[PDB]
Design an enzyme around this catalytic site. Structure first.
Site: not given
Length: 299
Positions: A55, A113
């Site tokens: 992010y 992730h």
């Protein structure tokens, strides 16, 4: 009264995540840092934050963590190693960088992730997991797990794990009840806690909804309980034994999500939401290019 899940290692995790950071080139977002700060300042109980290396919003999280008076013990921080698109060489490098940018000494949960490793990574799944095992042993990561893993991927980890993965964060909603085939059943049977990202997928692509049994029923329940549709869906995820992870730029929606445990749904209502959901076409918001081929087995 906030509810928690108990992980396989006996640790507790708040059963809803209410702050997400993934919400353009290289621009610090004052608006995001302000909403995170306000959430930490005003949301009662333990605030579960979902962060991720990919992010690139560690500075905003770090500034908010510094400026809030919310004590560290009342925050549960999940972070995620960017495996799909490389930013760091390895988990140890990623987490060291993250800890410094966040201004914290440890994360409460650290995830890989994606199972789909960037070609530019010179590290394999086994080696990455072993690094997470070391971060767990050293206390830099209080709990460790994975995200978006298929059954075969989890089996690869399980075959070489000294410390069993505690969490698998997957996309889950009434319109995507198995991100990949059998993942939910397998994870739950093997005491790997599922988190559900994009649990409110149905309320971000609401079409002729008034005509649809699912939305008619959801409105009925909202009116019955004097709770939002969102609250009903988040509570349904919890009732399926799964930890819903949500976001919002509206503080009142954030507070409403945290407050889902102010009511309960009957067994019949849980089953009916499930069944009406399953008879809807899949809706998939994430890992679209990888997992669209699994849409036929999602329901």
């Amino acid at each position: 009264n906030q509810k928690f899940f108990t992980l396989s290692n006996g640790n507790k995790i708040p059963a809803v995540a209410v702050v997400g950071t993934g919400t353009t080139d290289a621009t610090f977002s004052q608006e995001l840092t302000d909403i995170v700060k306000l959430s930490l300042d005003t949301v009662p109980g333990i605030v579960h934050i979902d962060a991720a290396e990919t992010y690139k919003t560690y500075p905003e999280l770090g500034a908010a963590l510094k400026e809030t008076k919310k004590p560290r013990e009342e925050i549960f921080i999940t972070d995620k190693f960017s495996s799909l698109h490389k930013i760091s060489e390895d988990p140890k490098s990623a987490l060291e960088t993250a800890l410094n940018k966040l201004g914290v000494d440890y994360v409460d949960l650290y995830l890989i992730h994606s199972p789909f490793f960037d070609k530019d990574l010179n590290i394999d799944l086994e080696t990455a997991w072993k690094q997470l095992e070391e971060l767990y042993k050293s206390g830099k990561a209080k709990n460790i797990g994975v995200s978006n893993f298929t059954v075969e991927d989890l089996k690869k980890v399980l075959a070489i794990a000294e410390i069993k993965p505690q969490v698998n964060q997957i996309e889950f909603s009434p319109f995507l009840q198995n991100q990949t085939p059998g993942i939910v059943e397998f994870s739950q049977k093997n005491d790997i806690l599922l988190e559900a990202y994009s649990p409110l997928g149905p309320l971000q692509k609401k079409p002729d909804a008034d005509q649809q049994p699912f939305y008619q029923y959801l409105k009925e329940l909202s009116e019955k309980y004097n709770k939002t549709e969102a609250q009903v869906l988040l509570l349904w995820v919890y009732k399926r034994g799964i930890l819903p992870v949500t976001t919002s730029a509206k503080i009142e929606r954030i507070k409403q999500a945290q407050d889902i445990f102010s009511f309960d749904l009957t067994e019949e209502e849980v089953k009916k939401i499930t069944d009406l959901g399953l008879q809807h076409e899949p809706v998939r918001l994430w890992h679209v290019d990888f997992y669209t081929k699994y849409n036929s087995e999602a329901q």
